[PDB]
Amino acid sequence: EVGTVIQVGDGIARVHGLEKVMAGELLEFENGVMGMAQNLEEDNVGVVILGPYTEIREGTQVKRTGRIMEVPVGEALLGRVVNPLGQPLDGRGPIETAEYRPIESPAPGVMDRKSVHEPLQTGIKAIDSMIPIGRGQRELIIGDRQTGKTTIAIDTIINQKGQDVICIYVAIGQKQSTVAGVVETLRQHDALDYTIVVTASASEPAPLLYLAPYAGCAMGEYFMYKGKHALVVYDDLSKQAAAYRELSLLLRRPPGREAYPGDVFYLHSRLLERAAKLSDEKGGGSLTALPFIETQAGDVSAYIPTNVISITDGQIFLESDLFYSGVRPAVNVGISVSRVGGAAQIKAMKKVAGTLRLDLAQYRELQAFAQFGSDLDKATQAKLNRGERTVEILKQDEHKPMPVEEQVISIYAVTNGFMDDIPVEDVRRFEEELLSFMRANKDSLLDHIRQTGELPDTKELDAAIEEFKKGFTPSA
Amino acid sequence: VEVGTVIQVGDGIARVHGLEKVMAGELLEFENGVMGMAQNLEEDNVGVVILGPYTEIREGTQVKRTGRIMEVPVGEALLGRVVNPLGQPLDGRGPIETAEYRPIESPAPGVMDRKSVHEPLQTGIKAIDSMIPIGRGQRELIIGDRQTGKTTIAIDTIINQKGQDVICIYVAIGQKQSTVAGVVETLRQHDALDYTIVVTASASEPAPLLYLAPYAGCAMGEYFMYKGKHALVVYDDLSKQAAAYRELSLLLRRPPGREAYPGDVFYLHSRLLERAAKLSDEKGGGSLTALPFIETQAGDVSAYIPTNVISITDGQIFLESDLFYSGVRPAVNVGISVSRVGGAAQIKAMKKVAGTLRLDLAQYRELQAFAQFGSDLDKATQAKLNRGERTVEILKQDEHKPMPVEEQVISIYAVTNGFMDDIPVEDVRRFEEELLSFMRANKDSLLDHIRQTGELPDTKELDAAIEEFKKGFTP
Amino acid sequence: GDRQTGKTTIAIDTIINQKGQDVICIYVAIGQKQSTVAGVVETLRQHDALDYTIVVTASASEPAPLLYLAPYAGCAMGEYFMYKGKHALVVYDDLSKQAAAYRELSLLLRRPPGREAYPGDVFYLHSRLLERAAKLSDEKGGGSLTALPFIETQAGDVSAYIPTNVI
Amino acid sequence: LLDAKASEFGARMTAMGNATDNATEMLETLTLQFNRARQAAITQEIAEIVAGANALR
Amino acid sequence: NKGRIIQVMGPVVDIQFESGQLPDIYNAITIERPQGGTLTVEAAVHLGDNVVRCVAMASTDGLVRGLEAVDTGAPISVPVGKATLGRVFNVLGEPIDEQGEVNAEERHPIHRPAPEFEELSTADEILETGIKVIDLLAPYAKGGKIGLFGGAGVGKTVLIQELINNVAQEHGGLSVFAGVGERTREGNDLYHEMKDSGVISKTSMVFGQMNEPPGARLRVALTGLTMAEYFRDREGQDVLLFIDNIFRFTQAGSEVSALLGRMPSAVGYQPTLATEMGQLQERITSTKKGSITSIQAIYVPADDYTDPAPATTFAHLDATTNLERKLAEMGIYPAVDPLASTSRILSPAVVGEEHYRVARGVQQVLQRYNDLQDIIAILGMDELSDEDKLIVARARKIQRFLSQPFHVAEQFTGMPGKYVPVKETVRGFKEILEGKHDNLPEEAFYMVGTIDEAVEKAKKL
Amino acid sequence: VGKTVLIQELINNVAQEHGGLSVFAGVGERTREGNDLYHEMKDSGVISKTSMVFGQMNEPPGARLRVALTGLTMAEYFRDREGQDVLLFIDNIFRFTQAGSEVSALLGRMPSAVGYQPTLATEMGQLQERITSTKKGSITSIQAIYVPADDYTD
Ligand SMILES: Nc1ncnc2c1ncn2[C@@H]1O[C@H](COP(=O)(O)OP(=O)(O)O)[C@@H](O)[C@H]1O
Ligand SMILES: Nc1ncnc2c1ncn2[C@@H]1O[C@H](COP(=O)(O)OP(=O)(O)O)[C@@H](O)[C@H]1O
Ligand SMILES: Nc1ncnc2c1ncn2[C@@H]1O[C@H](COP(=O)(O)OP(=O)(O)O)[C@@H](O)[C@H]1O
Numbered sequence A: 001e002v003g004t005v006i007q008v009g010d011g012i013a014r015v016h017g018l019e020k021v022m023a024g025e026l027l028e029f030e031n032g033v034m035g036m037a038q039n040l041e042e043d044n045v046g047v048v049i050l051g052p053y054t055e056i057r058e059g060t061q062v063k064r065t066g067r068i069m070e071v072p073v074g075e076a077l078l079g080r081v082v083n084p085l086g087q088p089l090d091g092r093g094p095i096e097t098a099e100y101r102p103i104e105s106p107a108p109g110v111m112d113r114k115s116v117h118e119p120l121q122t123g124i125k126a127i128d129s130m131i132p133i134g135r136g137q138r139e140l141i142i143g144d145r146q147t148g149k150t151t152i153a154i155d156t157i158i159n160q161k162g163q164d165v166i167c168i169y170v171a172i173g174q175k176q177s178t179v180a181g182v183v184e185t186l187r188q189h190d191a192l193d194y195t196i197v198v199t200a201s202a203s204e205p206a207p208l209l210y211l212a213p214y215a216g217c218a219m220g221e222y223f224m225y226k227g228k229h230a231l232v233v234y235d236d237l238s239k240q241a242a243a244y245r246e247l248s249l250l251l252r253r254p255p256g257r258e259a260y261p262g263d264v265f266y267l268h269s270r271l272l273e274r275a276a277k278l279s280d281e282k283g284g285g286s287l288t289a290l291p292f293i294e295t296q297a298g299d300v301s302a303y304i305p306t307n308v309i310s311i312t313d314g315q316i317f318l319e320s321d322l323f324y325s326g327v328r329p330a331v332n333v334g335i336s337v338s339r340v341g342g343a344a345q346i347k348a349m350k351k352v353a354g355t356l357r358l359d360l361a362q363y364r365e366l367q368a369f370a371q372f373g374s375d376l377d378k379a380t381q382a383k384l385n386r387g388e389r390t391v392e393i394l395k396q397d398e399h400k401p402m403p404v405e406e407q408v409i410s411i412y413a414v415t416n417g418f419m420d421d422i423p424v425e426d427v428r429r430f431e432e433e434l435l436s437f438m439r440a441n442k443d444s445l446l447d448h449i450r451q452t453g454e455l456p457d458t459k460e461l462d463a464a465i466e467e468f469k470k471g472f473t474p475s476a
Numbered sequence B: 001v002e003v004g005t006v007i008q009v010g011d012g013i014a015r016v017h018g019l020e021k022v023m024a025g026e027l028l029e030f031e032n033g034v035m036g037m038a039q040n041l042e043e044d045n046v047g048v049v050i051l052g053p054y055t056e057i058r059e060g061t062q063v064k065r066t067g068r069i070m071e072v073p074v075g076e077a078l079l080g081r082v083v084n085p086l087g088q089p090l091d092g093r094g095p096i097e098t099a100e101y102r103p104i105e106s107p108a109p110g111v112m113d114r115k116s117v118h119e120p121l122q123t124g125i126k127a128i129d130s131m132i133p134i135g136r137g138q139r140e141l142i143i144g145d146r147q148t149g150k151t152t153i154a155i156d157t158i159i160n161q162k163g164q165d166v167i168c169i170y171v172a173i174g175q176k177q178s179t180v181a182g183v184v185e186t187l188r189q190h191d192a193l194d195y196t197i198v199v200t201a202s203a204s205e206p207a208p209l210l211y212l213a214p215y216a217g218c219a220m221g222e223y224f225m226y227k228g229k230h231a232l233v234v235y236d237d238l239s240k241q242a243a244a245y246r247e248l249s250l251l252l253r254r255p256p257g258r259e260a261y262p263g264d265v266f267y268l269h270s271r272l273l274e275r276a277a278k279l280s281d282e283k284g285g286g287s288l289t290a291l292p293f294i295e296t297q298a299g300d301v302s303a304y305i306p307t308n309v310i311s312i313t314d315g316q317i318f319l320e321s322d323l324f325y326s327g328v329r330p331a332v333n334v335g336i337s338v339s340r341v342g343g344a345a346q347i348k349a350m351k352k353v354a355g356t357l358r359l360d361l362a363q364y365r366e367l368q369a370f371a372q373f374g375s376d377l378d379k380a381t382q383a384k385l386n387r388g389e390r391t392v393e394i395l396k397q398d399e400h401k402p403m404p405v406e407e408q409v410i411s412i413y414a415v416t417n418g419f420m421d422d423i424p425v426e427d428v429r430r431f432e433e434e435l436l437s438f439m440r441a442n443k444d445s446l447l448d449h450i451r452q453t454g455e456l457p458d459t460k461e462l463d464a465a466i467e468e469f470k471k472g473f474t475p
Numbered sequence C: 001g002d003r004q005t006g007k008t009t010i011a012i013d014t015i016i017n018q019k020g021q022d023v024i025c026i027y028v029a030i031g032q033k034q035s036t037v038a039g040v041v042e043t044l045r046q047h048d049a050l051d052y053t054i055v056v057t058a059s060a061s062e063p064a065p066l067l068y069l070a071p072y073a074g075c076a077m078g079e080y081f082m083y084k085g086k087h088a089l090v091v092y093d094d095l096s097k098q099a100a101a102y103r104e105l106s107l108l109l110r111r112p113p114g115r116e117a118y119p120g121d122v123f124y125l126h127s128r129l130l131e132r133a134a135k136l137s138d139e140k141g142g143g144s145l146t147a148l149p150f151i152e153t154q155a156g157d158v159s160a161y162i163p164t165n166v167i
Numbered sequence D: 001l002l003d004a005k006a007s008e009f010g011a012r013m014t015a016m017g018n019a020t021d022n023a024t025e026m027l028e029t030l031t032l033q034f035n036r037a038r039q040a041a042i043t044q045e046i047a048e049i050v051a052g053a054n055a056l057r
Numbered sequence E: 001n002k003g004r005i006i007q008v009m010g011p012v013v014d015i016q017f018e019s020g021q022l023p024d025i026y027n028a029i030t031i032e033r034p035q036g037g038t039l040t041v042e043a044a045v046h047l048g049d050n051v052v053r054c055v056a057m058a059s060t061d062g063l064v065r066g067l068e069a070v071d072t073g074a075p076i077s078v079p080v081g082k083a084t085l086g087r088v089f090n091v092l093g094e095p096i097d098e099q100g101e102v103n104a105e106e107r108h109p110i111h112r113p114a115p116e117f118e119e120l121s122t123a124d125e126i127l128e129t130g131i132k133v134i135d136l137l138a139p140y141a142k143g144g145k146i147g148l149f150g151g152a153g154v155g156k157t158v159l160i161q162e163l164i165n166n167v168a169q170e171h172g173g174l175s176v177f178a179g180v181g182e183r184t185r186e187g188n189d190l191y192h193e194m195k196d197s198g199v200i201s202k203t204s205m206v207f208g209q210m211n212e213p214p215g216a217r218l219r220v221a222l223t224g225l226t227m228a229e230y231f232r233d234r235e236g237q238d239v240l241l242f243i244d245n246i247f248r249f250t251q252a253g254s255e256v257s258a259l260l261g262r263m264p265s266a267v268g269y270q271p272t273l274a275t276e277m278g279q280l281q282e283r284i285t286s287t288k289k290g291s292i293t294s295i296q297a298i299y300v301p302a303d304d305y306t307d308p309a310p311a312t313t314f315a316h317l318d319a320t321t322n323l324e325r326k327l328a329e330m331g332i333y334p335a336v337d338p339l340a341s342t343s344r345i346l347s348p349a350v351v352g353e354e355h356y357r358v359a360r361g362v363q364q365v366l367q368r369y370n371d372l373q374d375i376i377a378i379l380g381m382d383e384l385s386d387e388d389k390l391i392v393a394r395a396r397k398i399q400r401f402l403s404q405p406f407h408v409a410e411q412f413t414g415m416p417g418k419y420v421p422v423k424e425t426v427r428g429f430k431e432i433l434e435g436k437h438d439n440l441p442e443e444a445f446y447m448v449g450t451i452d453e454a455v456e457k458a459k460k461l
Numbered sequence F: 001v002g003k004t005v006l007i008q009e010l011i012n013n014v015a016q017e018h019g020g021l022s023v024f025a026g027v028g029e030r031t032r033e034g035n036d037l038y039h040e041m042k043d044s045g046v047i048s049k050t051s052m053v054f055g056q057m058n059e060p061p062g063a064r065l066r067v068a069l070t071g072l073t074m075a076e077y078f079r080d081r082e083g084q085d086v087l088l089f090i091d092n093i094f095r096f097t098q099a100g101s102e103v104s105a106l107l108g109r110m111p112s113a114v115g116y117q118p119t120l121a122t123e124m125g126q127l128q129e130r131i132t133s134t135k136k137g138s139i140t141s142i143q144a145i146y147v148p149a150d151d152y153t154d
C-alpha cells in the first residue's frame, strides 16, 4: 500500500493516501529512508522522517510496513555502536539478529514488580554510601556542564566488569567526536564487550534524538524480560526534550511553558517507568536507569529538571562551587537523595553509612553558620572535625573504582573516630595506606564482607585498624 | 421565542445557531430547563455560557430566548438566608418570599448623585478604625497572602454592625463550601446572621456563577441604598472572580493579554465597585460600603489583578505574613496601608487621638533599627522606642472581639498620653482590658459623652479617672 | 547614556564645529518631540551651521514606519556626498526609538517576538545602517560618511539588548 | 585608653559609613537586575500565552 | 449507537456519529483494536457536523481511521461496596491484582454533582498523627481535608506513607488509596506494605500511574473517589481517602487541553483549571451521612507555590503541610515549613490554651531567627544583642526538634521511627522556650522523639 | 500632600496674571473624587476658569483611552483661537497608557515588552506632541504619573 508526499520541510512530511495506516506505524520512503506515522488526519498523514531528507520531495512515494515502530535487539548489539534505528555506525558490518522489540512499550504494572533490593555498585564511595543505587532503580544525574556527570556513568559501566550486567550508553545530542572518545575509553578499560552504544549525534534530525532513549530502553528491556540485569544511561534528556520541542513546534502543536509541549512530562515519565525490578514470577530481571539533566547556573528548580526529579527514585546533584573547591566527585549532599536507600546496599554498608547523608547535610549547614562568628563550644567543634574528615574520605579520583568491602572499612574507620587524631590533609593517604594494609594482611576481614554482606566482628576490626595506625607517620 | 439549535458544546460553553434577534447579555433557556447567558453575538452563531449542568446539552438541543437581562430577587426576605447568585436558597429553609427583583447589571450613581463620605463605618478593629478609617460609601480593598487574616477582618466588621442598622452582604466567590458553612455558623453564634445576606458561588459551580456572584450581592445591597438605608458588601474574593471571567473569555476565544486575562478584566471590577457609593441628600442619603478582597501570591502587589483593584478603590489594608507570625494580629501593615477618605470617616474624638498615634508609630518605625542597642541610646530615642512597643501592643487585638469606638478612643488616649509608660510591655494588653471594664462599670458618664457628642470628654476628668484605675492595677 | 545626560548637545556642537571644514552634516531626529527639533534648527541657524546641514525628522506623533525609515533616508542623503569624494557626518538621534518603532511594526505583522519583544532581525536593522558609513579607498574617491548613532539607556543599563547590539 | 576609644569609634563610624554606602551601591545594581527579571517574566510569559492561542486561531 | 474514527492525534480521537445519535459528554465509548483488545475512550467536546472529540483512557497507537466505535450510553462506571475492599483497580474499575472478578452488587458512574450546601458541616476535632511539626503547628482535623504540598524530592510520598502507618493501622473505618500519576514502583511497595500489616483488607486501591496516557491520569482519581462516596453515603462510615498525587489530575487536564482546542491560560494551564478542580474537590468532603478524612499529596512545579496548580489547590483545604527544599537540604525531615503550614483548628478553642500559646511562641522565635539570617551572614553573630543570641540558640534547637525519624523511613534515616503524642510534643517545645535545655548541644535535638530522648542523646556527645 | 490645592492654585494664578484658562482631564477618575474635586473647585472659585472632563473608572477602555484627547481639544481652542497660555492637567497619564493596553488586547494585537500594547510609544506621541507651544500661544501640561512596581524603567 502506497502514499505520495504532498509537502515536506525540516524533516516533516504530509502524505496523501496510506488510508489504512496505523498511528505510530513504521513507513519506508522510495529511497529506503524510514519514517513514522505520527498524525492521522482526516485525509492526510503527518510523517516524521527518521533519516536524511534531501532526496525526499513532493511526489516521493511512501510504503507502509504494517509494523509498529521497532528496533533490533539482542546479544549481537554488545560491543557495537548503533543509531536509534539499530543500524551499525562503527563500520564493522551488519548486526546478525533475529529478534526485534517495539520502541513504545507498556511499563511493568503494579503487580509485575518487586521492591528494589540488590546493589548496583558504582565503585564511587560518595554514591554507594550516601546515594545508593539499586537494580531496577531510576537515579537522575543532574548538574551544570563540566561538573562530572558523564564520568560518573562511565565509571559505573566500567565497574560492572564481570558482574554480569549489560550496559547501554545512549548519547542524545552530543558531538560525535565525544561519543567516539567515550567508546575508546570503554575499550581501554575492557568494558566495551558488555556495552551497547546508541547515538543520535547533534547533526541528526530531531526525531532520531527524540527516539534515541526509547531505542536504548528496548535494547535493555530485552535482557530484563529474560531474567538478566541491565543498565541504561540517557546522556542527556535535556537535549531529547529540546528535540521533542523542535518536533512538536514543526508540527504546529501549541506550545506551553518555555515553548515545550504539554506532554513533555509524559515524554520522560513513560521512558523511565519502563526501567524496573521485576517480580520472581516474571523472571527477577532488572533494568536500572541513569537519566541525565543539564542545568543552567545550578537551577534545579527549572521546569524540565523538576519534571525529571519528580519521575526518578532520587538524584545525584553536582555543583561547580564544590568541584572547584576540591570536592570531587562534586556531590551536593543536601539536595541529592536515594529514595530506595538502605534496601540497595549490603548490610555492612547500610550499618556504617546509615545516617551518613543526614550527618553531612547537618555538617554543611553548621559549617556555613560557624564562619559567621562565635568561638564554638566543644560539642560542635568535634562535629565539624569529624565532618571535614568524612568529606575527605568521600573525595575520590576519576576512573578509580573501589570494591564495596573496601568502602565499608574506610567509612567504618572515619565514622568510629579512627582518624580523629590524624591531620585533615593526611586523611586521604591514611585511607590508601590502610586499605593496602587490609588487603595484604587482613584479607580474612574483607572477605567476610564479600561473602556474607555483613560486618565482621567489630572488636577484631577495631584491633586491625589500631594495628595499622602504629605504622602510620603523619605529615604535621 | 424563534428558537435556536446547539452547534457545539464543551466545557460549559455552547455555540448556538439561530436566535437572530437575541440581546447581548440575555438570559436563555435550554430545552431541559437549564439556563444560559448570551455572551458573544457572532457572525454565524451565538456564544452561550451555561449556568448549570451541561452533560444533557448536546448538538441539536434547542434554546429559547427569554427577552430578559439577568435579574435577582431582592429585599428583606434575604436577611439570614444563604443563596446562590441567582437568588435560590441553598440553606434548605424553603423559598424566599419576595415580590421585588433588581437587575444584576445596573448603572452606578453619577457624579451629581453623590455626597462626600462623612459617616463612620466602625470595623471594631483598633488598627483599622484609627489608622485606615472606613466610611459609609467607601470602597476599601483588603489585600494580602493566603492565611494573613483577611476573612476574619470582614467577619469581625459584620459582627460589629450588630444594632447599627447596617445590612451586611457576604459574597463568597470560589471558596470551598465547607468554609462558607463555617462562616455562616460563626455569624450565627455572634448573633450577626439576622441582618446578613450570604451569596455563594462555591468552587464546584460553573464559572459564570463565580463571575455573577459579586454583581448579585451588589444588587442586594443597592436595594437598601436606594431606599435611604445603609449597607455593607464583602467580595471574598475578586481574584477568583477574575479567574472565572478569564476561563469564560478564553473559552469564547477572546484575545488574551497579561497573565491571559482579557482586555476588559479591569472594567469587570471597576463597574462593580463604582456601584458602591454615598448618595446625596436629594437621592435619599443611603450608602453602600464595599470591602473587596485580593489574594496576592508571595506578597506580589504589583501583579495585574491586584494593581487593577488597588487603582479602583479608595485605599487599601495590606496584611503581611511576617507581621502575622511575629504576633502582630491583626497583621496590618500600617505604614503602607491607606484610607483616601481619612479623617472625614472618623468621629472627632478618634481623629484627635489618632493624630498622635500615627506620628508616634512613624517615629517608632524609623528608630526601630536602634532597638537592639537598649540603654546605649540617648534618653529621647529610648522613650520613643518605649512608647512605640506599647502602642503596637494596643493595636494587637483578639479575633472575633470588636471594640466600640468610645472604648477605642479611651484606650488610644491612654497609651498616646503616656499613661502606660510605667507599665511593663508584657502587661499592656491586660492593662487595657482591665481599664475598659473599669471605665464601663464605674466611669460610664465619660464613655457616654463620646457616644453622644462624638467629642473627647474634659481631659482633666479623663486623666484623673485613668490615674484612679492605675492605683488598683498590679503588674 | 540616560535621558538628559547631554547626548544631543554633543552632536549639535559637533555639527557647529564643522563650519568651514567642508563637511556636510545630517541630523536625523527619530521619535523626538518636535519642539526640540525646532529648537535644534534654530540653534544651528544662530551659529551659521544650517547652510551645510540637512535635517531629517520623524517626530513622535508620526506613524511608526516613518520612524523606521528616517535613519536610512538620512544615510542615503549623506552617501551621495561620500560617493562623490566629499565628506559627510550623519547623526541618528536616536536608534532606541527607531528600534521600538520597528518592533511596533514587526508585532503588527505578527512576526514572532524575542528578547524584550523585539524581532530576531532588530540587530540587522542597525548593522546594515551603520555599515553603510565608511571611509572609502583612494580608487573609490576617498570620500567618507561618519556616523554618530544614539542609544538611550534606562538607569545606565548598558547590558540591555538594544544597547549591546549597537555597541 | 580614652584616645584609643575615640580612635575605635572614629574607625567604626567610617567603616560602617562605607558599608552603608556600599550597600546603597549594591542596591542599585540589585534593583537593576530585579527589574530586568520582572520585566522579562511578564514579557516572556505573554509571548507563550499568545503563541499557544495563535496555534488555534 | 455506532461511529467511525475520523482523526487520531495523540490521546485525542475524533469520532463521527449519525445525525442525532451523539453520545452525551463524559460517556464511555469502546473501539475494538485491530491488534485485539478494547480501547475505552471518553466523550469531551461536540465539534459539530456530528463529530465528538474524545479523550483516550489508553494508548491510541495502532488505531486506524474508519474503525467502528460504540457508545456505551453512560459514563465510565465502576464497582462500589465491599467487593472493592482488598482489591486493586485501574481507572475503568477492572481489577489489576489478578484475583478474578469483583462480585459487586452496584456499579456507579465516576462523574457526579457535588454534595449540596445543606449536607455539609465543619471538622472541629483533632486527629493525632504522632508527627511533632504537624500536631503542634498545623494539626489535622478528623473528617477534614488535608494537603501535603511539596516540590520534587522533598518527602510527600514518604509523609503520606507515614500517615498511613501512624493513623490507618488503628483506624475503625474503611480506606481508599488513589495513586494518581506517580511512581509504579511506589504503588508496588505500598501494596506489599499493606498486605504484610494486614490493613489491605480494610482498603480499596486504584492506580493510574505516571506511565499511563493523560486520559487515565485525568480520571483515575474520580474512580477512587466514587468508591469512597459509597462507603460514606450508603454505609455511613468514617473513610480515609489518600490521593498521591492530585496535581497529576490537573496536569493531565492541561495535557489534553491544547488538543481539545481550548486557548491556554497563564503558565500553559487549561483555562478551566479552577472549575475542573472544584468539581473534583467538592465531592471529597464529609457530609451528614458520613465522614471522609482526606489526605492529598500536592506537587509544586519548580518549587513555586505561586504556580496556578498549587495556588488554586489551597482553597480546598482545612490544614496544610508545606514541604520546602531548603529544610530538606539541611537534613530536617520531615521538611515542613513551620511558618507556611497552617490549620483551621490551631486555636485555643480546639487544642486548648497551652498548646496554642506554645505553638505561637515557637513560630515567633522562628520568625525572628529568619529575620536575623541576613544580618548574621554579613555582620556576624557577636554583634547581636543578648536577647537575640538567645533567640537564635533556641530557634536552632526548635528547628531540629521539629525533625523526627519516620517508621517508614527506617531505610533512609537508618534509625528506628518514633510516634510522639501531642501532650509530649507540647511539653517538649514548652521546655525549650522556657530555657530548660539551653546547655544541651544542637545535635541532641535532631532526629529524636520526646524531649527525654534529647536529654539522653546529649549524654552520648 | 496638596495635589488638588496646588492644581487649583495653578489654575488661579495662570488665570489671574497671564489670563490663561485651564482644562482638567480625569483619566480613570474615581467618581467619588470627581464629585469632591467639583465642589472643591466651586468653593475656591477656580471652577469658572476651568473645563473638566472625566473618563471614570467604571467606563470601558475606549472611554478612558480617549478622554484625555477630549480635554486636550478644548485646550487647543484656547491656545490657537484666543492666543492663551493654557494649563492641561491629566490625572493619571498612566491610566491613559493602561487603557491603551486594554483596548490593544481586545483588538487582538500581539503584546510588546512587559505586556504593553505594541503602539505604546506612538499612542503617547499622538497625545504629547499636541501639548506644545506654538507661535499663537502655549499649552503647558501637568500630569500625575503612576509608576508600576516602583520601576522607573517600566
Ligand atoms: N572525580 C573527579 N576527579 C577529578 N576530575 C574529575 C572528576 N570527575 C570528573 N572530572 C573531570 O571533570 C571534567 C568534566 O567531566 P564530565 O564527565 O565531562 O562532566 P559533564 O558530563 O557533566 O560535562 C573532565 O575533565 C573530567 O576528567
Ligand atoms: N522523614 C524522613 N526521614 C528521612 N528521609 C526523608 C524523610 N522524608 C523525606 N525523606 C527523604 O527525601 C526523599 C524524597 O521523598 P518522597 O516522598 O519520595 O518525594 P516526593 O516529594 O517526590 O513525593 C526520600 O527518599 C527520603 O530519602
Ligand atoms: N486577629 C487574629 N488573632 C488571632 N488569630 C487570628 C486573627 N485573625 C485570624 N486568625 C486566625 O488566622 C487564620 C487566618 O484565617 P483568615 O481570617 O481566614 O485569613 P485569610 O482569609 O487571609 O486566609 C485562621 O486560622 C484564624 O483563626
Ligand SMILES: Nc1ncnc2c1ncn2[C@@H]1O[C@H](COP(=O)(O)OP(=O)(O)O)[C@@H](O)[C@H]1O
Binding pocket: C001, C002, C003, C004, C005, C006, C007, C008, C009, C010
Ligand atoms: N556642556 C553643557 N553645559 C551646560 N549645559 C548642558 C551641557 N550639555 C547639555 N546641557 C544641558 O542639559 C540638557 C540635556 O542635554 P541634551 O544634550 O538635550 O541631553 P539628551 O539629548 O541626552 O537628553 C539640555 O537642556 C542642555 O541645556
Ligand SMILES: Nc1ncnc2c1ncn2[C@@H]1O[C@H](COP(=O)(O)OP(=O)(O)O)[C@@H](O)[C@H]1O
Binding pocket: F001, F002, F003, F004, F005, F006
Ligand atoms: N498650601 C496649603 N496650605 C495649607 N494647607 C494645605 C495646603 N495644601 C494642602 N493643605 C492641607 O492638606 C489637606 C490635603 O490636601 P489635598 O489638596 O486634598 O491633597 P491631595 O490632592 O493629595 O488629596 C488639605 O485639605 C489642606 O488641609
Ligand SMILES: [Mg+2]
Binding pocket: A149, A150, A151, A235
Ligand atoms: Mg557529559
Ligand SMILES: [Mg+2]
Binding pocket: B150, B151, B152, B236
Ligand atoms: Mg479568606
Ligand SMILES: [Mg+2]
Binding pocket: C007, C008, C009, C093
Ligand atoms: Mg536629546
Ligand SMILES: [Mg+2]
Binding pocket: E156, E157, E182
Ligand atoms: Mg511522590
